[PDB]
């Protein structure tokens, strides 16, 4: 009777293992992303272009499956659940660039610095979106508010020589944008350690090319990981 008993589980194990083998490829194919940003970031409008206490959007670009998460976590200065997100491909960070006086920008920098140096996120890249690039231009052009009053370091900043400003824009918005970008790139480069990088970008709600940027950034991240693994980079 016992020998017959062995047969029954022996049979059940086989179907479950076949099912697990079937699910393994589907699990391995997909790529996971985490969407994280401050309040007033613009995360709600950015996900809309993609659509064309938990929230997931699943899409496909060039026969590649991307699955994006969005954890609310409202009013939580401490984040004990972020340990679970150490296996994602990349982390998407959204910050409103025009909110340099409403300090909210300093809060965004503090959050970015806290995220970068976390123990469990030592090998996760960050894709940076500097949202609201037209409110910033309108505010700077013929605006009473001055950046130097809120940020003392802006007085001794110069326009970079390697910059590639878009056509038709004044030098003032260019210097402001590049100063804001460098304010993040400095923290990104201070303790990079050669394992993970940051990809700054400039986006506004109308732009529809974002998803292509995410695709390219993910491809570059995987290529860099593979190149470094084989002692070539």
């Amino acid at each position: 009777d016992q020998r017959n008993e062995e047969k029954a589980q022996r049979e059940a194990n086989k179907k479950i293992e076949k099912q697990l083998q079937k699910d393994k490829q589907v699990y391995r194919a997909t790529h996971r992303l985490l969407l994280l940003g401050a309040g007033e970031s613009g995360k709600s409008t950015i996900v809309k272009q993609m659509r064309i206490g938990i929230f997931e959007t699943k899409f496909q670009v060039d026969k590649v499956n991307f699955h994006m998460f969005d954890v609310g976590g409202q009013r939580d200065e401490r984040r004990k659940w972020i340990q679970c997100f150490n296996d994602v491909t990349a982390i998407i960070f959204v910050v409103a660039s025009s909110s340099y006086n409403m300090n909210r920008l300093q809060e965004a920098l503090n959050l970015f610095k806290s995220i970068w140096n976390n123990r469990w996120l030592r090998t996760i890249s960050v894709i940076l979106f500097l949202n609201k690039q037209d409110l910033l231009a309108e505010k700077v052009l013929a605006g009473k508010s001055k950046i130097e009053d809120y940020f003392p370091e802006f007085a001794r900043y110069t326009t970079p020589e390697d910059a590639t400003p878009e056509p038709g824009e004044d030098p003032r918005v260019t210097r402001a944008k590049y100063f804001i970008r460098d304010e993040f790139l400095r923290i990104s480069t201070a303790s990079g350690d050669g394992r993970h990088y940051c990809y700054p970008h400039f986006t506004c709600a109308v732009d529809t090319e974002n998803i292509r940027r995410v695709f390219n950034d993910c491809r570059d991240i995987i290529q860099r990981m593979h190149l470094r693994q084989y002692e070539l980079l």
Partner: protein
């Protein structure tokens, strides 16, 4: 207003004086002539594979044979420890789970995670297919632990600094326990299921009353977050583990701690804590990719449990004390003896 608030601080002093008065002598002075347990070496007996991602929780069955485990793939697997073969595999609606439970009657299984819902699965359908029985909602934060008090009512702790008691048939909270400031990270039930404890994130472990619904005592020993908790088998004491690489043994009747378990060569956090059948051995998993075995009455190491390639995130001892199981982020489950 504020003057009433002072009266409360005066009451708090009184508590400190009352606790200090009864401290005749520490446990170390009391227990010194006892012989040490010696060197204990445990060798792996079984190893279970099949999980595609990291493992977060597990719970031994009441029959000392079956055990359940949950992973971030989104699947609950029920094993058979004797013949290392699987029985069930339940896909999940949400791929993030932080806890799991096994009913004392071996009839129900629960799980919960970032989604603010505790699900209950019926193992014994007439058809023979696992399916969702009920879905409980009402929390505003991620769940951390859940234990079956009986076959019809369950207790859960969440990340909104509250603990609640549920009714499976109706689905509405019966009693809500409030008073914590930090996140609640774990809980355990007494052998008679009349009282239970909880370890918050603000370094404060409380003792609750299931029937009445009010706090009874509060202990403020640690200085950092508390990640694990469990009762002594007698039911008069409990042990907690924190991120500062120390484990403390408290006492309900005396109302303060008695011993501390720490060493100068370890500075990493602690994830799980469990006792033994007789309460003589204290087991705790660390972030050092391995485990340690303590002596309850002397605070001295008696063995090391190594073999895991990544950090340990679970630990459990069977009812009869025949084996201890550990789960790690390496997607592996091991049985020791």
């Amino acid at each position: 207003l504020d003057q009433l608030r002072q009266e409360a601080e005066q009451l708090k002093n009184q508590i400190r004086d009352a606790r200090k008065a009864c401290a005749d002598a520490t446990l170390s002075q009391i227990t010194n002539n006892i012989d040490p347990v010696g060197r204990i070496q445990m060798r792996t007996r079984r190893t279970l594979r099949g999980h595609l991602a990291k493992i977060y929780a597990m719970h031994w069955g009441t029959d000392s044979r079956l055990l359940v485990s949950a992973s971030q793939d989104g699947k609950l697997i029920i094993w058979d420890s004797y013949t290392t073969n699987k029985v069930h595999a339940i896909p999940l609606r949400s791929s993030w789970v932080m806890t799991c439970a096994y009913a004392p009657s071996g009839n129900y299984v629960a799980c919960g995670g970032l989604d603010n819902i505790c699900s209950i699965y019926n193992l014994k359908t007439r058809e023979g297919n696992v399916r969702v029985s009920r879905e409980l909602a009402g929390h505003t934060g991620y769940l951390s632990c859940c234990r079956f008090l009986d076959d019809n009512q369950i207790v859960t702790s969440s990340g909104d600094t509250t603990c609640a008691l549920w009714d499976i048939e109706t689905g509405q909270q019966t009693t809500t326990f409030t008073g914590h400031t930090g996140d609640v990270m774990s809980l355990s039930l007494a052998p008679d299921t009349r009282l239970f404890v909880s370890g918050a994130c603000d370094a404060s472990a409380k003792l609750w009353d299931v029937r009445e619904g009010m706090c009874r005592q509060t202990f403020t020993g640690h200085e950092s977050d508390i990640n694990a908790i469990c009762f002594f088998p007698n039911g008069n004491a409990f042990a907690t583990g924190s991120d500062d690489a120390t484990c403390r043994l408290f006492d309900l009747r005396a109302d303060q701690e008695l011993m501390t378990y720490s060493h100068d060569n370890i500075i990493c956090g602690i994830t799980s804590v469990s006792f033994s059948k007789s309460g003589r051995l204290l087991l705790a998993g660390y972030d050092d990719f391995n485990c340690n075995v303590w002596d309850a009455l002397k605070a001295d190491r008696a063995g090391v449990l190594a073999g895991h390639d990544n950090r340990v995130s679970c630990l459990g001892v069977t009812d009869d004390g025949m084996a201890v199981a550990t789960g790690s982020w390496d997607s592996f489950l091991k049985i020791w003896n």
